[PDB]
Design a protein around this ligand. Structure first.
Ligand SMILES: [Zn+2]
Length: 55
């Protein structure tokens, strides 16, 4: 529920964002609720490139 919900922006494993590598919105509090590739807590790994072998 809202009001008193959102405290994971320091030492926690954030959940990967619904876009994973294509996120488009960007807020100061969204980075704390969803993780992204390139962060020490990213953990989505939903087949985005696969060892760069798409030829
Ligand atoms: Zn995001």
């Amino acid at each position: 529920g809202p009001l008193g919900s959102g405290s994971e922006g320091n030492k926690v494993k954030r959940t990967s964002c619904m876009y994973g590598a294509n996120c488009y919105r960007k807020n100061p509090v969204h980075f704390q609720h969803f993780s992204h590739p390139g962060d020490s807590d990213y953990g989505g790994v939903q087949i985005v490139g696969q060892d760069e072998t798409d030829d």
